[PDB]
Amino acid sequence: ADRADILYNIRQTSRPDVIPTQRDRPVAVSVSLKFINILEVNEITNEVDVVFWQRTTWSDRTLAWDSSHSPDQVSVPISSLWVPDLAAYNAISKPEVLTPQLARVVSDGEVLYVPSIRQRFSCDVSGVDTESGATCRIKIGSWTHHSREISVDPTDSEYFSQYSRFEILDVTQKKNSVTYSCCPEAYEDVEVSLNFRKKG
Amino acid sequence: ADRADILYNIRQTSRPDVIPTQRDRPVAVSVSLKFINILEVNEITNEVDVVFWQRTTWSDRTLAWDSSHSPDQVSVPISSLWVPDLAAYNAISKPEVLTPQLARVVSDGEVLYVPSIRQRFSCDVSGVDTESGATCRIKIGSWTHHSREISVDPTDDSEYFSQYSRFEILDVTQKKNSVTYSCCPEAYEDVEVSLNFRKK
Amino acid sequence: ADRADILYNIRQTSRPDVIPTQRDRPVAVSVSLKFINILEVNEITNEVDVVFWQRTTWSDRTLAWDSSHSPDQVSVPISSLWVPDLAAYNAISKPEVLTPQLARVVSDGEVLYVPSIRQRFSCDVSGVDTESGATCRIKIGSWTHHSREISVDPTDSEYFSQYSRFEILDVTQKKNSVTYSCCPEAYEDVEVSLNFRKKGRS
Amino acid sequence: ADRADILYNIRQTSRPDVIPTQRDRPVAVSVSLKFINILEVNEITNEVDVVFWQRTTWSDRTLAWDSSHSPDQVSVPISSLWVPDLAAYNAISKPEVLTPQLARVVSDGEVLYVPSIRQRFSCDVSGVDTESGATCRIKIGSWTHHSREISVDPSEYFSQYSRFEILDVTQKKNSVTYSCCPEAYEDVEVSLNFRKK
Amino acid sequence: ADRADILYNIRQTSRPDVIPTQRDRPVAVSVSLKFINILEVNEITNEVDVVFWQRTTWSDRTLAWDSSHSPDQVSVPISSLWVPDLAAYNAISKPEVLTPQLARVVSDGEVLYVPSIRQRFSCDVSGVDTESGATCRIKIGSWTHHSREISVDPTDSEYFSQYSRFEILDVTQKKNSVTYSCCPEAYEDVEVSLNFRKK
Ligand SMILES: O=C(/N=c1\ccccn1Cc1ccc(Cl)nc1)C(F)(F)F
Ligand SMILES: O=C(/N=c1\ccccn1Cc1ccc(Cl)nc1)C(F)(F)F
Ligand SMILES: O=C(/N=c1\ccccn1Cc1ccc(Cl)nc1)C(F)(F)F
Ligand SMILES: O=C(/N=c1\ccccn1Cc1ccc(Cl)nc1)C(F)(F)F
Numbered sequence: 001a002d003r004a005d006i007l008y009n010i011r012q013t014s015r016p017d018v019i020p021t022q023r024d025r026p027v028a029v030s031v032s033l034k035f036i037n038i039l040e041v042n043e044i045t046n047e048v049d050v051v052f053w054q055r056t057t058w059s060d061r062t063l064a065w066d067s068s069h070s071p072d073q074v075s076v077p078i079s080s081l082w083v084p085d086l087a088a089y090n091a092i093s094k095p096e097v098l099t100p101q102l103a104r105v106v107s108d109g110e111v112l113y114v115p116s117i118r119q120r121f122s123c124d125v126s127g128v129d130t131e132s133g134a135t136c137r138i139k140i141g142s143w144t145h146h147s148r149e150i151s152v153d154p155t156d157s158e159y160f161s162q163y164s165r166f167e168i169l170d171v172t173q174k175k176n177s178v179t180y181s182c183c184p185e186a187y188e189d190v191e192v193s194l195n196f197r198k199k200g
Numbered sequence: 201a202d203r204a205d206i207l208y209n210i211r212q213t214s215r216p217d218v219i220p221t222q223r224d225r226p227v228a229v230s231v232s233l234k235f236i237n238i239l240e241v242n243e244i245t246n247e248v249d250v251v252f253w254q255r256t257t258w259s260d261r262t263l264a265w266d267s268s269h270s271p272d273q274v275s276v277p278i279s280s281l282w283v284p285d286l287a288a289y290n291a292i293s294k295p296e297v298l299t300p301q302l303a304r305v306v307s308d309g310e311v312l313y314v315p316s317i318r319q320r321f322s323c324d325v326s327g328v329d330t331e332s333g334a335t336c337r338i339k340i341g342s343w344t345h346h347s348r349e350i351s352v353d354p355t356d357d358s359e360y361f362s363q364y365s366r367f368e369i370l371d372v373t374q375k376k377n378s379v380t381y382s383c384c385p386e387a388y389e390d391v392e393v394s395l396n397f398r399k400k
Numbered sequence: 401a402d403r404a405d406i407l408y409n410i411r412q413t414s415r416p417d418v419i420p421t422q423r424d425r426p427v428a429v430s431v432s433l434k435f436i437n438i439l440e441v442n443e444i445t446n447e448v449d450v451v452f453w454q455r456t457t458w459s460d461r462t463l464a465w466d467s468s469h470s471p472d473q474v475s476v477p478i479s480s481l482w483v484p485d486l487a488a489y490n491a492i493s494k495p496e497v498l499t500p501q502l503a504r505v506v507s508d509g510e511v512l513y514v515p516s517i518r519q520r521f522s523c524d525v526s527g528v529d530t531e532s533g534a535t536c537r538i539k540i541g542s543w544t545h546h547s548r549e550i551s552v553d554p555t556d557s558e559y560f561s562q563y564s565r566f567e568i569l570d571v572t573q574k575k576n577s578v579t580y581s582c583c584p585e586a587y588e589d590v591e592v593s594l595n596f597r598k599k600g601r602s
Numbered sequence: 603a604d605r606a607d608i609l610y611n612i613r614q615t616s617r618p619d620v621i622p623t624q625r626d627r628p629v630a631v632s633v634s635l636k637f638i639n640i641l642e643v644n645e646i647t648n649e650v651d652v653v654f655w656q657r658t659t660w661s662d663r664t665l666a667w668d669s670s671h672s673p674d675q676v677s678v679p680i681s682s683l684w685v686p687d688l689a690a691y692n693a694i695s696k697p698e699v700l701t702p703q704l705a706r707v708v709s710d711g712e713v714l715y716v717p718s719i720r721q722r723f724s725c726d727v728s729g730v731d732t733e734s735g736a737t738c739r740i741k742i743g744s745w746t747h748h749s750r751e752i753s754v755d756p757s758e759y760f761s762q763y764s765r766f767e768i769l770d771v772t773q774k775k776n777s778v779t780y781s782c783c784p785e786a787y788e789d790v791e792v793s794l795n796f797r798k799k
Numbered sequence: 800a801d802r803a804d805i806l807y808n809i810r811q812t813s814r815p816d817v818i819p820t821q822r823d824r825p826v827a828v829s830v831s832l833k834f835i836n837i838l839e840v841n842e843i844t845n846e847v848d849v850v851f852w853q854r855t856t857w858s859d860r861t862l863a864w865d866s867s868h869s870p871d872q873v874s875v876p877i878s879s880l881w882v883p884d885l886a887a888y889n890a891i892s893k894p895e896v897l898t899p900q901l902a903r904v905v906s907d908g909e910v911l912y913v914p915s916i917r918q919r920f921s922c923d924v925s926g927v928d929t930e931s932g933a934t935c936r937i938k939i940g941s942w943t944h945h946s947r948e949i950s951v952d953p954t955d956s957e958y959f960s961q962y963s964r965f966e967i968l969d970v971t972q973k974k975n976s977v978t979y980s981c982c983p984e985a986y987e988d989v990e991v992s993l994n995f996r997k998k
């Protein structure tokens with residue numbers, strides 16, 4: 001089988017609107033942000049405009065194929081796959097995806113999607129012009145799938161632009177969960193704590 | 201039946217362009233705003249820029265399925281369902297939907313859609329910098345369906361409000377109301393949401 | 401017949417791409433603006449940013465159905481119907497439609513479409529900070545259908561925001577026509593004259 | 603045949619991705635700009651923001667019909683037709699089409715498309731505040747079709763409310779050749795001479 | 800064969816979502832920028848806004864045809880072809896494509912795509928107001944295809960606007976590769992070094 005055959009079989013099997021739960025097990029989604037740039041910071045409005053690679057992985061075992069004598073990976077448009085409905089709870093702009101909207105699918109059904117995103121957040125910008133810096137917390141989880149359907153798991157300056165006016169002191173990525181006043185269900189999130197300051 | 205079968209059945213039965221009226225009853229739509237952020241306020245132009253969760257529910261009994269031995273809820277793209285044609289009568293920008301455009305459909309045909317919306321409004325910002333604050337009224341109802349076709353009913357004010365806003369919420373009231381246009385006798389139902397807020 | 405049947409039959413019969421001319425008659429389009437808000441005014445550049453309800457009506461007899469024992473109206477997405485190709489001749493931005501893009505179709509084939517539009521115009525803003533105010537003229541007609549294919553007919557503060565910095569002194573809506581030096585065809589328009597000023601002047 | 607029949611046959615016949623060359627001839631595209639407004643000018647950055655009607659005509663004879671006893675012209679969405687791939691070589695923004703994206707198709711296969719475009723250009727703004735004014739040159743031609751495939755040939759509607767006025771508009775045939783390749787690309791060079799009032 | 804027959808063959812054969820690899824060879828993509836304009840430069844934020852023609856070529860030999868007695872080129876919408884998933888690694892805005900999204904397909908299966916792009920970058924703007932000027936480095940390569948699937952190869956003021964406030968001192972285009980600390984795979988790129996200054 002060649003790449004054309006692998007993509008045809010993915011198109012025949014993939015259900016982009018169906019979460020690929022295995023044994024009524026939650027889909028385990030791994031989310032990890034790599035900060036690339038901090039573009040605009042407003043300490044009076046508590047708003048930041050950031051660029052980050054949102055490294056996202058999960059398994060869809062329905063997409064698996066035998067790769068003994070075939071490619072074991074292909075690039076696929078995300079419109080052909082199920083993708084987790086992740087949202088940043090303190091976002092104040094829609095995610096601007098800067099890069100081609102392609103995922104990698106491995107022959108075992110593992111999916112990797114790493115969009116470069118520019119987005120604006122409401123977060124604590126107090127202290128940005130001090131030595132100890134600001135700590136801006138970004139919360140990302142499923143918008144519509146509670147913890148029985150999607151679980152979110154985490155995994156500093158390595159890809160950060162050396163040309164930014166700002167620098168990263170530390171990034172922490174911690175598992176958390178949100179429950180709503182109405183309903184029993186918990187929604188999982190990753191809390192990403194970006195400690196940064198203006199360069200001296 | 202699995203999630204795939206539920207979504208296939210929704211695609212076979214859903215009529216996104218047909219209001220799901222049962223007998224000749226109006227569709228009962230519940231609308232409730234949770235304020236998340238107040239980003240900009242202009243006392244001279246009487247304009248506010250806000251982020252809110254618009255919690256919207258209704259019933260479409262054509263979508264119902266037997267869930268004795270299947271999932272009793274699924275996430276569905278709103279493009280596959282009928283959605284009420286709600287509009288904010290005093291909006292001065294298009295609603296910017298920040299979140300994935302997915303609804304939850306329950307096996308009894310109940311639908312929940314909770315978009316996070318950033319939008320700008322024309323409303324009374326007088327008193328915003330005083331202790332008693334401003335009261336900004338936002339009117340949301342059906343644009344094209346009168347009260348025989350759609351009825352709109354309302355349901356801690358600060359529980360999800362950003363601590364990083366320059367503003368704080370004193371009170372939110374959500375009241376039933378109706379608009380009638382000069383030209384005809386038909387009444388359009390709305391919820392009037394009164395946001396009493398002030399500068400910190 | 402239920403609403404589903406009416407919409408299915410509209411989808412079967414409606415030709416969104418075909419102007420519904422009856423006999424060899426122009427389609428009679430009624431256009432009427434209700435001003436809701438005046439957002440930004442620049443007296444140096446002569447530009448205004450306004451929100452208005454563009455009340456639009458016409459008849460498409462191909463859509464008609466027997467409603468003796470069925471609903472006599474439905475809401476329909478505009479993508480399923482023919483809609484007049486109206487444009488503002490002095491617009492300097494695309495019309496931003498703020499509302500659901502649904503029309504009402506009555507069982508006699510009458511169509512009503514009332515989008516809330518935010519749009520920017522090049523017009524006379526001189527005098528906005530005077531007692532007599534500015535008069536900004538907006539011209540709306542068919543972009544591509546001349547007067548033998550589409551005729552445009554008209555029909556003040558009732559829906560204007562009380563919270564605007566501006567007040568409306570008067571709105572007049574007058575029938576007009578444009579002819580191009582090139583070609584014989586006359587294009588009908590409505591000329592909407594918005595006379596407004598800043599509130600609270602000395 | 604009624605309007606519905608003419609539009610159905612246009613939809614059945616039209617090849618939006620195929621240049622409608624007749625014989626071995628280039629498609630003859632006529633382009634003429636009518637300036638409506640000059641909105642912003644920057645003498646330091648040499649940038650202008652302008653509104654113009656881009657009057658564009660060509661022939662697609664495959665669309666022709668007998669109109670002895672039928673309408674001679676119909677409005678068609680451009681997404682149903684072949685349209686020349688015109689670009690402004692010195693544009694620094696995407697063309698913003700302000701008007702309904704409909705062309706007129708005549709029963710002989712002539713096509714007319716007149717979008718109202720707002721667009722920003724890099725051009726000579728020096729002298730805008732003088733009596734003799736600035737001359738901003740806009741070059742428009744096929745991006746991907748050379749002169750064997752497409753040939754390009756060339757104040758009444760200018761807003762009285764602009765803070766600028768038009769002294770003169772010249773529209774001259776020209777061609778661009780790339781150092782890489784033999785192919786010549788035809789263009790119209792539009793010289794807009796304008797000044798602050 | 801007429802143009803319609805050539806395009807119908809392309810539309811039937813082209814697989815827009817499938818990289819056209821020959822055997823287990825990478826697809827060899829050529830990328831070359833021609834700078835047209837430098838519009839905004841911010842020495843405090845280290846941001847530039849630029850317009851460039853991104854000349855992009857590759858081969859898809861499945862598309863080839865006999866042109867002895869037919870056109871040897873046609874214009875095709877990129878939505879009907881495979882196109883390399885190129886991205887600028889230091890971009891801070893989406894690429895704004897200013898031109899029609901058409902590629903040329905040549906009868907030997909060579910494909911040429913030359914979009915005019917306006918885009919904003921994070922790069923070194925220090926020295927822009929000096930005689931020696933700033934050097935802004937732009938990295939462009941495959942976002943999702945490593946060096947076994949796509950190889951990227953390069954190939955000065957000739958098309959640069961005389962009306963810019965800036966002028967080009969030099970452009971160098973060098974082959975490079977990026978590796979991620981996660982995985983063995985190398986991703987090929989072109990590093991374009993734009994040396995420019997205020998006039
Ligand atoms: O982590 C990885 N790739 C990164 C990481 C950061 C930035 C870019 N890429 C390349 C890449 C790989 C796959 C997909 Cl779907 N999208 C992008 C690696 F090595 F796994 F490919
Ligand atoms: O109200 C609820 N969820 C909220 C409330 C506020 C913000 C987010 N969500 C999660 C959510 C659930 C379902 C849908 Cl369709 N959209 C979003 C609850 F609890 F009922 F799920
Ligand atoms: O004019 C009318 N409605 C108005 C007038 C102004 C603003 C809103 N609406 C509601 C409405 C009704 C139907 C359609 Cl298609 N679009 C909007 C009325 F009452 F005649 F329907
Ligand atoms: O300039 C011209 N027409 C204008 C100019 C401005 C506004 C309207 N029209 C009419 C018109 C006719 C046909 C097409 Cl496809 N598009 C528009 C003309 F007629 F010369 F082509």
Ligand SMILES: O=C(/N=c1\ccccn1Cc1ccc(Cl)nc1)C(F)(F)F
Nearest residue numbers: 745746780782783901902903911912913
């Ligand atoms: O390099 C070339 N053309 C250029 C070079 C720079 C700018 C524009 N064009 C025209 C052109 C040709 C083909 C394609 Cl797909 N897209 C555009 C040439 F001559 F080889 F076609």
